[PDB]
Structure 1
Amino acid sequence: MKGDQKVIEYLNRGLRSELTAVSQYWLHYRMLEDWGYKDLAKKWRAESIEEMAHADKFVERILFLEGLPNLQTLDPLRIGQTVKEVLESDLAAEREARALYQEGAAYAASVGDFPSKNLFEELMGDEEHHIDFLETQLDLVSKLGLELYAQHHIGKLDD
């Protein structure tokens, strides 16, 4: 069904934002695993896979509106080199994603494309829940110090 061009442009911007998050969180998952924080690595793997589902929803909506999904490029990755930098890098990215979806939802609403608007609002609520998770981890790091926070999430040793 032919969609509004500008809504499709917002969908493609959101697709790029998710593709960035998928790779940033996957590499952070593998970094946390390499540093030994297996329980943080678990959660980051799961979070990357949630971003993969978001990416796929934008691909599907762009095609239905007869647009061309563009997976060629990512936004710049922010890669942390301590557990606190990983938290701060992902928080920054998620704040940008939330602001993009807020704008995409408002634009879609303005042209009557209510299903695209509900897609952006659903994604904006999901990224606010991830923001809430990341802010809570940074709150623990500030109250306990980074070492006590990270040590609690080393996890169990593999059989």
Structure 2
Amino acid sequence: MQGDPEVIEFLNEQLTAELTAINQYFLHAKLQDHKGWTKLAKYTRAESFDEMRHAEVLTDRILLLDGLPNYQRLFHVRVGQSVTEMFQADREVELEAIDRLRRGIEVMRAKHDITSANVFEAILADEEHHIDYLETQLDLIEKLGESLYLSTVIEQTQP
């Protein structure tokens, strides 16, 4: 058994994407926790862990077909200062990922490979859920007010 080259190319693209996402999410988690904002930090931390699990599963699969995982590349990473910028960066990344996932699932299942198609289907469902949450939070921030919004996620620790 030896998966065709194009399947491996798509798997490698998705792996690199998930890696860059992991890096971005962890950096944002730290940089938010540093400022006092706590619950946002916890949420982003859990999100990063989930993306880590994604990367692991994709690596295992791409390795089962007699392939060569690519742990050397990385796409551009973005950073922000306020909240709106962080949320917008995350939304952009998720949109790109979803588009790639759909195109790949189509072109792949058109060649009799099924398990990889199922993997992509699961990843797609999860990424869609995540982008939905992001959009909801962004709309909320837009409505309430940046200061009045932040005013509800700042708590003093237990010294």
TM-score bracket for this pair, using the shorter chain length: over 0.9
1:73 aligned to 2:99? no
Residue of structure 2 in register with 1:115 after alignment: 115
| Deviations 1:70-111, CA, capped at 9 Å, x for gaps | 011111011121111111111111111111111111121111
Residues 158, 80 of structure 1: alpha-carbon distance in 2 compared, 3 angstrom cutoff: farther
Which aligned runs of 4 or more in structure 1 are off by greater than 4 angstroms?
none
| Deviations 1:23-58, CA, capped at 9 Å, x for gaps | 000000001101211100000000000000111111
Query: Aligned AA for 1:62?
Result: I
Q: How far 1:158 moved relative to its partner?
A: 4.0
Residue of structure 1 in register with 2:58 after alignment: 58
Residue of structure 2 in register with 1:23 after alignment: 23
Structure 2 residue ranges without an equivalent (≥5): none
Query: Aligned AA for 2:119?
Result: L
1:148 aligned to 2:148? yes
Q: How far 1:151 moved relative to its partner?
A: 2.4
Q: In angstroms, what is the RMSD of aligned CA positions?
A: 1.1
Identity of aligned residues (%): 47
SS of the equivalent of 2:151 reads helix
Distance 2:4 2:145 in 1: 49
Q: How far 1:64 moved relative to its partner?
A: 0.3
Residue of structure 2 in register with 1:36 after alignment: 36
Query: Does structure 2 retain, via aligned residues, the 8 Å contact 1:40–1:154?
Result: no
Distance 2:156 2:12 in 1: 40
Q: How far 1:156 moved relative to its partner?
A: 4.6
Distance 2:52 2:152 in 1: 28
How many residue pairs align between the two structures? 159
Residue of structure 1 in register with 2:84 after alignment: 84
Residue of structure 2 in register with 1:124 after alignment: 124
Structure 1 residue ranges without an equivalent (≥5): none
| TM-score where L is the length of structure 1 | 0.95
